[PDB]
UniProtKB/Swiss-Prot annotation, chains A, B:
Gene: rep
Reactions catalysed: TSAVLQ-|-SGFRK-NH2 and SGVTFQ-|-GKFKK the two peptides corresponding to the two self-cleavage sites of the SARS 3C-like proteinase are the two most reactive peptide substrates. The enzyme exhibits a strong preference for substrates containing Gln at P1 position and Leu at P2 position
Activity regulation as described: Inhibited by pyridone-containing alpha-ketoamides compounds 13a and 13b. In turn, alpha-ketoamide 13b (tert-butyl (1-((S)-1-(((S)-4-(benzylamino)-3,4-dioxo-1-((S)-2-oxopyrrolidin-3-yl)butan-2-yl)amino)-3-cyclopropyl-1-oxopropan-2-yl)-2-oxo-1,2-dihydropyridin-3-yl)carbamate) inhibits SARS-CoV-2 replication in human lung cells. Inhibited ex vivo by michael acceptor inhibitor N3. Inhibited ex vivo by compound 11a and 11b.
Effect of residue 90 to R: In strain: Beta/B.1.351
Compartments reported by the entry: Host cytoplasm; Host Golgi apparatus; Host nucleus
Span of the entire protein shown here: 3264 to 3569 of 7096
Protein name: 3C-like proteinase nsp5
Lineage: Viruses, Riboviria, Orthornavirae, Pisuviricota, Pisoniviricetes
Protein's job: Cleaves the C-terminus of replicase polyprotein at 11 sites. Recognizes substrates containing the core sequence [ILMVF]-Q-|-[SGACN]. Cleaves and inactivates human TRMT1, preventing tRNA guanine(26)-dimethylation of tRNAs. May cleave human NLRP1 in lung epithelial cells, thereby activating the NLRP1 inflammasome pathway. May cleave human GSDMD, triggering alternative GSDME-mediated epithelial cell death upon activation of the NLRP1 inflammasome, which may enhance the release interleukins 1B, 6, 16 and 18. Also able to bind an ADP-ribose-1''-phosphate (ADRP).
Effect of residue 49 to A: Does not affect ability to cleave and inactivate human TRMT1
Length: 306, 306
């Protein structure tokens, strides 16, 4: 019993974290096979983050300008290239701790674990979601760039995020492992403001099913609704519109608990219109939206990883 | 910026998790050097959890009755002994992934990371606190027994919890790694109810400092108070009494933010008496008490682990 914000085991990713230093800038890199991936703004100095021309800044960089340190050993850089907003540093040693892995570009609403690192050393792990405005609400300080977000399916690590920037509002932005930013953000210290932080409706519903499974049932009402009628309420509270795809994805949780998806929507509707009246759900006083339906099934069924 | 429920990197502990099977019962064990630690109720059957006599049940067990599997390899058990509520299974192979480690019995209010496991395979990691009633609010399903809680100080893993039981109320109980239960709980399926779940006052205050550091300052009032006057409010809301030791421990956070500890107490007092009026603090609608002062400093300063 009990439901917690749960991250994947980070050991497979810890063995891939290295320290990359260019000039006086040090951040983290990801060492997979014989390539080290890191944010391209490692080549930037302080005066340059306002308006960097990365192509021009890279002309003055050779392989030996990139210092890559794994633990206490220096990796030999034998080639380097820029792919979008990441650099790929070819090293002469394949990472012996390389796990089975994929590179995935996730959709908004999807969750992943972040291994926060500093100077190539892991500091902590927590669970994140890609917000609908393509930011993430993480915990990152100076030097955390290059920290990655990932999912694990048994023995395969799916890397989906690399941390690049912190916006003036305290939220965070980054790229996939191909170097393409999530959302409209750029690796420049400029005026870029995040859009509306809408709530991930399907995730709240999943979390409500998780609450029912674990004994929190006070919010179950006597009402039902339709997708169109619920979405009229979702729009007012800046909730994502619920689609039939979302209903379908919640099928398994609906079947296990015997509560029709549209019944749970009517329960959510009452919670949005009347608040929680000082009660709590799974130890929270607000509606949680960073659990996916698959996360709930995983944690309520005990899926492991080899 | 940003403040998150953050667990330690679990890689050092993942390499120690094994599967222990006795008869038809399978749970998790912790393999350090040439000893495997696991809950002693691995030797129990279903009819036996009501009133087990472990000394008698152990008489019918030999070394070869304990099947210990690390990954896909069978470990050779060459000795076994019961220490309080854990079994120590001497194996003939030292764990080559053994990290620097200690065994620590933590105090209530202290936090730690849990590596939830099933069949010796890690499933996820999350942060927990030892509640003042000596329970923990975890996420454990059948087969999770033997999962451990731990802290890391750079390169030393301090193991402080092994999971044993789930109470009828959905909370969790366990032992230190010497086999002594936290609180009055026993490894028997009996009537044992948890006491008052009081709030860890010093941890809430630490978390309020973390909020100030990250830009949430609306709760800062114009008032101050005394320890005795604040504690009169703490008692009403089932808060731990604050002591001078607690004030001293908050010194560093007080100095960094320039807010006297007793000023922050007066802010907490107003929050308890008037609620949050629908606002949030660090993304929460309730007062969080599972961050220690040391946790806040760690996450706000970027401490790493080698
Ligand atoms: C030119 C691109 C660029 C380079 C930087 O080095 C940079 O610096 C930071 C990045 C992230 C954080 C944080 N806390 O996540 C803090 C930082 F100072 C920002 C930035 F856009
Ligand atoms: C005789 C001692 C004993 C043996 C058990 O095997 C047991 O079983 C469970 C333990 C923990 C959980 C959970 N979800 O944490 C679930 C369980 F069924 C309980 C118990 F007291």
């Amino acid at each position: 019993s009990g439901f917690r914000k749960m991250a994947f085991p980070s050991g497979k990713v810890e063995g891939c974290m290295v320290q990359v230093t260019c000039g006086t800038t040090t951040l983290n890199g990801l060492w997979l096979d014989d390539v080290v991936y890191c944010p391209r703004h490692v080549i930037c100095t302080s005066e340059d983050m306002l308006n960097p021309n990365y192509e021009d800044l890279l002309i003055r960089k050779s392989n030996h300008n990139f210092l890559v340190q794994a633990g206490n050993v220096q990796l030999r850089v034998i080639g380097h290239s820029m792919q979008n907003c990441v650099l790929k540093l070819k090293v002469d040693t394949a990472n012996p701790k390389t796990p089975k892995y994929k590179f995935v570009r996730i959709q908004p609403g999807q969750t992943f674990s972040v291994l926060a690192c500093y100077n190539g050393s892991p500091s902590g792990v927590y669970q994140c979601a890609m917000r609908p405005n393509f930011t993430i609400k993480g915990s990152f300080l100076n030097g955390s760039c290059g920290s990655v977000g990932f999912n694990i399916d048994y023995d395969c690590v799916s890397f989906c995020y690399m941390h690049h920037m912190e916006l003036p509002t305290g939220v965070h932005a980054g790229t996939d492992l191909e170097g393409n930013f999530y959302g409209p953000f750029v690796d420049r210290q400029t005026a870029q403001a995040a859009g509306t932080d809408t709530t991930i409706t399907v995730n709240v519903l999943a979390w409500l099913y998780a609450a029912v499974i674990n004994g929190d049932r006070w919010f179950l009402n006597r009402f039902t609704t339709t997708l169109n009628d619920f979405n009229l309420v979702a729009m007012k509270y800046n909730y994502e519109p619920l689609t039939q795809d979302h209903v379908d994805i919640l099928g398994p949780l609906s079947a296990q608990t015997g509560i029709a998806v549209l019944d749970m929507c009517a329960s959510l509707k009452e919670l949005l219109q009347n608040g929680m009246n000082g009660r709590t759900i799974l130890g929270s006083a607000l509606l949680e939206d960073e659990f996916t339906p698959f996360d709930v099934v995983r944690q309520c069924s005990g899926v492991t990883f080899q």
